[PDB]
A paper describes a structure:
To advance the understanding of esterases, we have identified and characterized E53, an alkalophilic esterase from a marine bacterium Erythrobacter longus. Family IV esterases, to which E53 belongs, are widely distributed in microorganisms, plants, and animals, specifically degrade short-chain esters. The family IV esterase can be characterized by the α/β-fold hydrolase group, and contains two distinct structural domains: an N-terminal CAP domain and a C-terminal catalytic domain. The catalytic reaction relies on the S-H-D/E catalytic triad located in the catalytic domain.
Residue numbers in the entry:
A (entry chain B), B (entry chain A), C (entry chain C), D (entry chain D): 4 to 312
Amino acid sequence: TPFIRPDMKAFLEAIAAMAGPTLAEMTLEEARASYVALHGMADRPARELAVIRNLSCPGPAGDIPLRLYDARESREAGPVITFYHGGGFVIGDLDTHHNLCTEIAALMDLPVVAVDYRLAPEHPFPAAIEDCEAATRWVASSPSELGRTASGVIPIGDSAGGNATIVVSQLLGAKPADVPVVLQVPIFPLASDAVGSASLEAFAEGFVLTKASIEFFDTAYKADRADPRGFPILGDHTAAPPTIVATASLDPIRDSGRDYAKALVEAGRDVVYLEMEGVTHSFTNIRAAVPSTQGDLERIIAAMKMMLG
Amino acid sequence: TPFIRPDMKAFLEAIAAMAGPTLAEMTLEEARASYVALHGMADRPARELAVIRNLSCPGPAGDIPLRLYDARESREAGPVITFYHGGGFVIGDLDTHHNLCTEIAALMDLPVVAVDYRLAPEHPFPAAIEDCEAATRWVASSPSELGRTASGVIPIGDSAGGNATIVVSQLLGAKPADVPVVLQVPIFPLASDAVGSASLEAFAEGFVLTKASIEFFDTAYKADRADPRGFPILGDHTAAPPTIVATASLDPIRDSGRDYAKALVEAGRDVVYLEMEGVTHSFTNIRAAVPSTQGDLERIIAAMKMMLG
Amino acid sequence: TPFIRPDMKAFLEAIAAMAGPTLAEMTLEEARASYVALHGMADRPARELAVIRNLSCPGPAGDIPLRLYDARESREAGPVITFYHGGGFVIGDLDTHHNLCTEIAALMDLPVVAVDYRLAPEHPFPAAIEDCEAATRWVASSPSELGRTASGVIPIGDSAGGNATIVVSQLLGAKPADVPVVLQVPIFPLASDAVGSASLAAFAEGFVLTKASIEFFDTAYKADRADPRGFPILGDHTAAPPTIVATASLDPIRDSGRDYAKALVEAGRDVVYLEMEGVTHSFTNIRAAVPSTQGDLERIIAAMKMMLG
Amino acid sequence: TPFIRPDMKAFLEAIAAMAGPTLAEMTLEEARASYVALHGMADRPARELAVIRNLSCPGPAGDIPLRLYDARESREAGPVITFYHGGGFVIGDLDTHHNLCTEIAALMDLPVVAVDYRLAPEHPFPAAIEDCEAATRWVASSPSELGRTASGVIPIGDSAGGNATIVVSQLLGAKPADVPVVLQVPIFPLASDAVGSASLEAFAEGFVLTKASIEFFDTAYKADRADPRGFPILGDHTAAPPTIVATASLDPIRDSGRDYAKALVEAGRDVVYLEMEGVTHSFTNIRAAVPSTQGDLERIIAAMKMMLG
Ligand SMILES: CCCCCC(=O)Oc1ccc([N+](=O)[O-])cc1
Ligand SMILES: CCCCCC(=O)Oc1ccc([N+](=O)[O-])cc1
Ligand SMILES: CCCCCC(=O)Oc1ccc([N+](=O)[O-])cc1
Ligand SMILES: CCCCCC(=O)Oc1ccc([N+](=O)[O-])cc1
Ligand SMILES: O=[N+]([O-])c1ccc(O)cc1
Ligand SMILES: O=[N+]([O-])c1ccc(O)cc1
Ligand SMILES: O=[N+]([O-])c1ccc(O)cc1
Ligand SMILES: CCCCCC(=O)O
Ligand SMILES: CCCCCC(=O)O
Ligand SMILES: CCCCCC(=O)O
Ligand SMILES: CCCCCC(=O)O
Ligand SMILES: CCCCCC(=O)O
Ligand code: NA
């Protein structure tokens, strides 16, 4: 049997005992609220920060809501973290990942701008990507309303947001923003199609993210399987920015993250590959329920500081 | 027209002006002396250290000479770096890599033990591996002659020595020493056979390490292509220790390092892959002639500190 | 302090920073290799020539290897330059001075024959002299193997080779070859014993050639202090051929070359004395690292053309 | 005993057969006239030149007559030769050395300005020197009357004029004129006191210049034996300009020129020493009676061109 940490296993066993409905058995609204409730109980509380401020920027389909997190009211020029939440491009919002954003801002002492991008099925592919790209370009322009100067941007995100991280880095690589992507941090990302992977079959059930849920998100989002904005393993890696790929050993889409890190090495790009042992998908947002996952987040933070120099 | 840093280019132009005999055209003693002279003129001078001491330990063929480097006269238990010099398993000694060892000791603030392993053609494969393994096990046993206690070992080395790094970590993985390998650092290693690789053809001449020298070393050492002690890409990667793989973009054996880091990701192991841009093989020992390579070494140092947490 | 050109000073600072061992502290083959690397890395690249050909002639110990350089594939009878490399009669070979030889051949438009004479300590005094004399007489005989008829010979050489230049001219003056010495060009020669000289004390350290190296060479070669083949200031100067003596103002053996040119004037012989200002011993072979030394060599070339008519 | 060329010997025999009187036996006017007659008969005819023009300049005791020689009516800026005739500071004028001056101007393609300096015993030491210095400074100032621009000056002169050459170079070295002395050419100069020298006794009679005449000149000129303006061997040689010293092997004051060239080498100064074999003092002005002395002058010319670049 696969190795599972004791605190992780207890979390999984409690979820199994609840025996709740699948995403397909719920309404959209019920599914989104269930995710809000999961992270609300499972994650550590928000860090206190000097700045937690709602902003917005123009997008291709209207204003894109943003949330700015900063431990400092006033700071020197530096990189700005641009964050895209997970949820399959169907669920999640600025609140489901709020506490994680405050933690990243507190531990990095950098500003974090989270993106409230358009969700499927109401707005299918490529809506989320268009919004994530637009918001990152806007931050990269050091607009007056941001209140600090960006010398570069750091795309970061979990699951679907790790997909968006890579896609944004590819889009900005092809058509630069006002400053470069200095580092990207895809966290358990979907880079290659998970269908047919060994990890998908091994961890299809019982490891937080299920095969059933992956299928539900895919049907809602309707990403074109040949489009690198849907599956960025298909993109041009030859100028990828410095990268930290974090995966989880029990993740059904673990092998997609392995595939991406291998593609970067094959292209000669600098990459840190961290595969967290004995924890699942979503470990960044269950840090109270599974206290050892705070340590996993902290390893990602230490790698980011090293790769920023 | 691959990218070459200006200071790197100037060094290559001087080597081209020199236009010496090949290694195979020299006597063995001349070939070894020419490597002493190259690193002697090209590398930064030694750091001053509290401790630089010659030791030996028992090996399968007789005593193995060693050299201990430590910035501290007295130090508590901690990891000990075990270093294996490059030179194709044919050339190099404790002096060719002395200055680099003093730099590693100074910048890491950890003890370094360099291994004066037996060389081919006089001692063919697996002599060098036997000696590197034996010395590493000896250091790992916290002998009184060392004057330090090891809580773990950190194998590190450049080119052959990077080959030896991986092989030693595999041998100690299979049959543990008294403490574990807590980190390995293969620097432009030979892991897979370079014959047939795209990098070997692209950088066969004019990039410090030549295809001719690679063939000279191979003929002397006589490693079996099917033996994982000769080509450690063939070994079992499923329990590889935390790894930093450092390569050079102009290295004929660059793709061998790429292959190894890809195999570690494929096996789910934690790895930092750094491919230094615009510099050749041997960048760790040309830090005066090509001043920008000091910064490349400092990037490896920073990755080591991060991976040691 | 003494005048030092800025590019010369930078080279001396680089040598000082390297802080290498003395020749005596190296193995003999490491000492030889350090000199290969010094010239190899500091000198300008070889000129392209129509003819660069290895050959040999008989000598008293066996065959003497030679290298012919000629900008012309075929040429009529004319003077032939016979070149003897520096290195204390201990180090140096055809390759350490190869590029300089191609430059002399190109700029003079005369053939150059360089002599691979036997070295100390393996072959002590007068081995080097026997071989240089024998090769020069052989060239002077217009052998068919050379393919260039000699109407005269031009002995030339740097440091120990400048010693050989003068000794050869004295030996051929006393027992003529088939054609005369029409010009000799001792470049920073050892003519009188440098022990006790003001220049030896003034430039004992930090000026390329060191007092320690002079002593190392003297111990290996074992020249008799009373033998004019060892110290040709002791020889008969009354029929010395037309001479160009070139010295360096920062050379510990500068005063030896001053002594020789003064003895030629005392004897009524025609001599051009050129003391290059602000450069060291070996200036003929560091023409890339210290670009201004190319002009010093060109001044010697101009004096040679004038003295040949 | 000493080597004498056949053409030189016959001229000496003809002088002996004519059996003229000594300078002491003649009247001053007769002595001066015999010198005009000697060079008029013995030297090659004047070259035809575009410019042979009398000039004058201010001096410390009145105006100094000059004669300008130039193959060109109009020329670019360049060095100007400043010539001082021989004659012991007692005899000689602008006409005694006129043909030589036309030859120097024709063969160098440079302007020559000859100085008609004050003569002893009417004007004893240091009169001649004061005028030679003033005229050279005037030329060096590129005065309108000169008709061409001087970028440097070249002092040149035979016997007493070679004395003046060296003294002028020393005085301008200590107190620069408007342009530097770029080259000096003392021709059989009096630099050190000839009294006591081996050459003076060996060639005291029968070699055109006699010990009797040397003494005659000395008594008239009354140079101070301790004054470097009388005997410039006593001056500071450490900044002497590039120098060509020409002597004659049968000259009673040959050793004086040897001494000066040796002093320049001792001081580390660049110098061409040419000792013309088998000819006497005055060889520059007997080029028809002794035809081979034209070739001697032409060697000086060739050295001058080389030393000017
Ligand atoms: C019901 C809670 C599990 C789903 C939430 C989650 O685990 O965040 C994901 C985001 C994107 C993808 N995906 O793109 O497949 C999968 C998972
Ligand atoms: C004189 C050129 C540098 C060659 C020595 C060197 O650069 O260290 C190496 C060690 C091993 C291998 N190899 O295994 O191919 C290549 C290089
Ligand atoms: C490494 C610098 C010393 C290399 C040798 C060299 O500089 O060429 C010489 C040849 C002969 C003598 N000598 O006769 O003493 C000195 C020098
Ligand atoms: C027939 C007269 C002698 C010819 C030589 C001559 O008159 O040229 C000299 C100039 C100066 C000195 N001196 O300074 O001794 C000697 C000789
Ligand atoms: O979801 N759950 O049943 C939970 C909720 C809270 C908790 O502390 C542990 C488990
Ligand atoms: O164990 N816990 O605390 C939990 C458990 C389940 C959950 O959905 C969130 C937190
Ligand atoms: O005065 N002259 O022309 C001469 C003098 C001597 C001589 O042998 C020939 C010619
Ligand atoms: C061009 C080779 C692509 C990657 C091969 C691998 O995944 O091991
Ligand atoms: C194949 C040699 C050129 C380098 C192209 C690459 O980075 O893979
Ligand atoms: C370039 C100077 C001409 C002199 C050529 C010679 O006679 O050797
Ligand atoms: C030529 C006779 C002149 C004598 C000049 C003098 O007494 O100095
Ligand atoms: C450095 C020397 C320049 C001038 C040479 C001389 O004194 O004759
Ligand atoms: Na050789």
